[PDB]
């Protein structure tokens, strides 16, 4: 779900209303959940 996944957070960070800049790193979060899903 690589890019479709990250195109959802982007689709979240802009539903707040505030027409303000938004910047994230799918690669980094995807890597954190990876470890996170290694045994917890």
């Amino acid at each position: 779900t690589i890019t479709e996944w990250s195109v959802n957070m982007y689709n979240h960070l802009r539903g707040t209303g505030e027409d303000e800049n938004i910047l994230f790193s799918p690669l980094s979060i995807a890597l954190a959940m990876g470890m996170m899903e290694l045994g917890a």
Binding site: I2, T3, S6, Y10, L13, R14, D19, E20, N21, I22, L23, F24, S25, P26, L27
Partner: protein, 33 residues
């Protein structure tokens, strides 16, 4: 000559081609800073 003046709001993708994984993503509403 296509002309692309990004003098107004846009979204971006610092991404890798060969693999297709996205590094950084977002949109630029305010270019100031």
């Amino acid at each position: 000559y296509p002309q692309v003046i990004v003098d107004h709001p846009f979204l971006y993708l610092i991404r890798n081609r060969k693999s297709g994984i996205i590094l950084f993503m977002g949109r630029v509403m305010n270019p100031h800073h």
